[PDB]
Design a binder for this molecule. Structure first.
Ligand SMILES: [Zn+2]
Ligand SMILES: [Zn+2]
Lengths: 369, 369
């Protein structure tokens, strides 16, 4: 199936294009601002589906043309008249089509033009009223506040927020791309009798700003986004996409002594934390118990033994363990425990713990064995 | 300071004893059922604080004595008459002291005996009305339903629940021990003008049972308790303490091929998941990108390179990385990426990912480089 994407160099277009060529066998024809007139006609006539993502004015519109019909949709539809196959057309209109600002009125004229055209020529049309959008590949410093904020914050550049209480209505680019694909396969999502992209968010600029600063500072405090809040999850991914390409990595804090090292990896207030222990050959660590703190030890390299002895008891219990067979040892409360490197190489143990380490109120008590 | 713990062989006593000898310099004198009469007198006369945890009847009470004063508190107070120092006394009474069941009435008689005694002899008294208790070291199959449930469930033994809607009022042993220690240092927690252990929970048997089965099944599904629900956190620790001593470990599921292995460690619905990748020397994995899935790679053994290339782009970006210096590489969306083992030994990478892996709806697209 031949699919043309107008506005192909825009945010949604680049996203839709990358997806479609990856997840389908459709032939994708990209049209944009720089597209020569003859190859536009060429692509449109071959087309089985039109995804119309272009802005309202033609690429040729500049200071000269203040007067004159400069409607790009009109021109696109004008060409499709000769299209033998009656390709379906998807129009990205805006929720501003109800408002009486000139942008909305423009968008409402586009819908109306397309409805009239469809009724005469038979094309099936999917007309969406999209809210503001966000996601990877949106140009920063150019009419998208989220992209601008992500770009600046990731660079320690200061941002300008006039009113934190301003509410934004938003769709994430993934939902836009998924919806377009549903329309392509012939089953749009219908709410209130109209095609509607799911998962719209309503968020204040203040919430957005706090989230972005949290994502930034999370690097240093080893914390993690709340990933079952859909907006926050989508926002975190989009934030990551604005990272300078030299800044994808960050050093961890290793606690180093004669025995090896202990290093925190990720910390959460609600699902514990994970760290990396490295022990030099011959080394024993631990010999302590807890009332309530508990751990999962997972040896991923080298070999050794994890030992237990109930506080009120004499029996030592040994778990022989190595990176050749991956197995978790829970560390039950009320058992003193130790871990020993029995091999010739550094032993590395991943340790999940149920709470944060606080040496003020430690919950760990020295007891050998 | 000399501290005597009556009922020292009980659940709270064992717990308090382990803590006190670990976190303080106090001399701890344990008295219990088997304690000879002369060493009871001996301990009580030396005492600076009495922690009275014993049951209402004397160790000597058996079928013979249906008639007669068999009050252990009375006897204990009777001896303390000769105690020159006026040691403070902590009494663990019960919230049943208000109810007119014989257990409550017993407890109310103990309080009343102690208040009268204090008023004549001057001892400062801390009288608590504790609810039901839970925590490690509570005997299973003996009047504690939580201990019984934990013990049976951890052994795949079937449990008997009559009414799931029965509500329990509970304190966790840690709060009991911490409170006793506060009373010892002279600053009890006061609510409503009376000493009161904080953090009482109110929970149905049904909630308890569901939580315990979740903790059990979590072993197989790699999931984790919700650790910012205090009850659930305390319950999880207590559950662990009932594990058979041969059953502290569990194997993970390694996905093994010619290249090494991939193994899931922990999975959460709200803070992502962590897995372990192991690559044999010379191996490259990845060469894919995501729309929204993102990862943190942390190399903990061996050495190699993590590579990136923006989907719309030509520039390959390389992060040289090894277990000698622990550093996280974020994997931003819209970048195809790969990881290669450059050393002579297996390379092990810990990978956090923001969502569950679903190869039905995969969010990963093959693209080299
Ligand atoms: Zn430990
Ligand atoms: Zn990946």
């Amino acid at each position: 199936m031949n699919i043309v994407i107008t506005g192909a160099k825009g945010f949604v277009g680049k996203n839709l294009k990358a997806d479609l060529t990856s997840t389908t066998d459709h032939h994708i024809f990209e049209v944009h601002r720089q597209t020569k007139e003859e190859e536009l006609e060429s692509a449109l006539l071959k087309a089985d589906f039109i995804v119309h993502l272009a802005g309202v004015n033609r690429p040729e519109h500049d200071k000269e043309f203040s007067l004159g019909n400069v409607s790009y949709l009109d021109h696109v539809l004008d060409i499709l008249t000769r299209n033998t196959k009656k390709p379906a057309i998807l129009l990205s209109s805006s929720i501003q089509a109800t408002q009486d600002n000139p942008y909305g009125e423009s968008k409402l004229q586009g819908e109306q033009l397309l409805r009239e055209y469809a009724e005469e020529y038979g094309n099936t049309v999917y007309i969406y009223r999209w809210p503001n959008l966000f996601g990877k590949w949106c140009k920063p410093n150019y009419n998208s506040v989220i992209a601008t904020f992500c770009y600046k914050i990731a660079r320690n550049e200061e941002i300008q927020v006039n009113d934190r209480n301003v509410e934004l209505t938003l769709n994430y680019v993934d939902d836009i791309v998924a919806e377009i694909k549903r329309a392509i396969e012939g089953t749009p999502t219908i709410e209130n009798g109209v095609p509607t992209v799911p998962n719209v968010f309503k968020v204040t600029l203040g919430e957005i700003v706090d989230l972005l600063y949290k994502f930034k500072q999370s690097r240093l405090d080893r914390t993690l986004p709340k990933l079952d809040n859909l907006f926050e999850k989508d926002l975190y991914s989009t934030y990551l996409s604005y990272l300078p390409s030299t800044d994808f990595s960050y050093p961890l804090l290793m606690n180093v002594d004669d025995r090896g090292s202990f290093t925190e990896f990720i910390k959460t207030p609600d699902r514990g934390q994970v760290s990396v222990n490295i022990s030099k050959p011959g080394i024993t660590k631990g010999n302590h118990w807890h009332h309530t703190k508990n751990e999962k030890f997972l040896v991923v390299s080298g070999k050794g033994v994890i030992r237990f002895r109930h506080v009120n008891d004499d029996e030592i219990i040994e778990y022989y363990v190595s990176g050749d067979k991956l197995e978790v040892v829970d560390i039950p409360v009320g058992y003193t425990h130790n871990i020993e490197n029995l091999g010739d190489t550094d032993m590395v143990t991943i340790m999940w713990v149920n709470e944060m380490f606080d040496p003020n109120q430690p919950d760990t008590y020295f007891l050998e064995v």
